[PDB]
């Protein structure tokens, strides 16, 4: 199967809302070893976001039910654990694609930042589901991926770039939800918003302004 066939299949899969299929297609495309285009990496990103997202959403419902409770608790525990291993296997899939192919072949700063954010995101999803000794090590890998991406984005992208903004958003969420550092989360979110607002005049600014809206909503929610 050549790359272009796989990418068209991935697009079919997307429209069918069959994201496992979509992920498998873009996994195999990535494994060919050629640097992905903007379109291709966005398809890889959307595919796995939906694949992991389903498990994350399920995990939240079941872990909550486990808290709100008997023999029902052991069942809810075991089901959470089943969902967790699915979730970990997906995260590790993505993370090894990032290490073996995506990050090394990333020829541009934009790309490097995109993939490092992605590395931060997927370690963060592991962090959500980690406990015991492992968690501190998982959280630090997330934070280092984000931090490197954060530095590169500050140096080489404008404040209104959607990838720079998107990074600010996710990194702020990392601080609030994983590190429980509300003040760092807010200051990071506020400066990203403010620096973007100050930028006068964005070429295709629909995505950028959407993230700005999400940044401010987070600020409103976190400030009571």
Ligand X SMILES: CCCNC(=O)CCOCCOCCOCCNC(=O)c1cccc(NC(=O)COc2ccccc2P(=O)(O)O)c1
Closest distance to a second copy from the beta carbon of 124 (Å):
21
Closest distance to ligand X from the beta carbon of 25 (Å):
18
Based on the shown chain and the rule CB under 6 A, indicate whether residue 40 belongs to the binding site for ligand X. Answer: no
Out of a second copy, ligand X, none, what residue 169 binds, judged by CB under 5 to 8 A for its kind, is ligand X
With CA atoms as reference, report the closest residue to 166 among 96, 126, 99, 113.
113
Based on the shown chain and the rule CB under 6 A, indicate whether residue 120 belongs to the binding site for ligand X. Answer: no
Based on the shown chain and the rule CB under 6 A, indicate whether residue 211 belongs to the binding site for ligand X. Answer: yes
CA atoms within 13 A on the CB side of 142: 26
The correct pick among 49, 88, 190, 216 for binding ligand X (CB under 6 A) is 49
Closest distance to ligand X from the beta carbon of 43 (Å):
15
Based on the shown chain and the rule CB under 6 A, indicate whether residue 173 belongs to the binding site for ligand X. Answer: yes
CA distances from 206 to 45, 124, 147, 150, 202 (A): 19, 27, 26, 22, 9
CA atoms within 13 A on the CB side of 98: 22
Based on the shown chain and the rule CB under 8 A, indicate whether residue 136 belongs to the binding site for a second copy. Answer: no
CB 113 within 8 A of CB 157: yes
CB 94 within 8 A of CB 59: no
Based on the shown chain and the rule CB under 6 A, indicate whether residue 50 belongs to the binding site for ligand X. Answer: yes
Based on the shown chain and the rule CB under 6 A, indicate whether residue 160 belongs to the binding site for ligand X. Answer: no
Out of ligand X, a second copy, none, what residue 173 binds, judged by CB under 5 to 8 A for its kind, is ligand X
Based on the shown chain and the rule CB under 8 A, indicate whether residue 9 belongs to the binding site for a second copy. Answer: yes
Based on the shown chain and the rule CB under 8 A, indicate whether residue 17 belongs to the binding site for a second copy. Answer: yes
Based on the shown chain and the rule CB under 8 A, indicate whether residue 25 belongs to the binding site for a second copy. Answer: no
Residue 99 main-chain phi, psi, to 5 deg: -75, -45
CA distance 32 to 71: 48
CB 80 within 8 A of CB 66: yes
Contacting residues toward a second copy, per CB under 8 A: 5, 8-9, 12-13, 15-18, 54, 57-58, 61-62, 65, 71-72, 75-76, 79, 83
């Amino acid at each position: 199967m050549d790359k272009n066939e796989l990418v068209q299949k991935a697009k079919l899969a997307e429209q069918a809302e069959r994201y496992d299929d979509m992920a498998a297609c873009m996994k195999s495309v990535t494994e060919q070893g050629a640097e992905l285009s903007n379109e291709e990496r966005n398809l890889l990103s959307v595919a796995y976001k939906n694949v992991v997202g389903a498990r994350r959403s399920s995990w939240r419902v079941v872990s909550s039910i486990e808290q709100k409770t008997e023999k029902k608790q052991q069942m809810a525990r075991e089901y959470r654990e089943k969902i967790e291993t699915e979730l970990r296997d997906i995260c590790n899939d993505v993370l090894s694609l990032l290490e073996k192919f995506l990050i090394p072949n990333a020829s541009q700063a934009e790309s490097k930042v995109f993939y490092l954010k992605m590395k931060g995101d997927y370690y963060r999803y592991l962090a959500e589901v980690a406990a015991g000794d492992d968690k501190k090590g998982i959280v630090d890998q997330s934070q280092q991926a984000y931090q490197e991406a954060f530095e590169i984005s500050k140096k080489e992208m404008q404040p209104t770039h959607p990838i720079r903004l998107g990074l600010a958003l996710n990194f702020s969420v990392f601080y609030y939800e994983i590190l429980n550092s509300p003040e760092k989360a807010c200051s990071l979110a506020k400066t990203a918003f403010d620096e973007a607002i100050a930028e006068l005049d964005e070429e295709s600014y629909k995505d950028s302004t959407l993230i700005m809206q999400l940044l401010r909503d987070n600020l409103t929610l976190w400030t009571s």
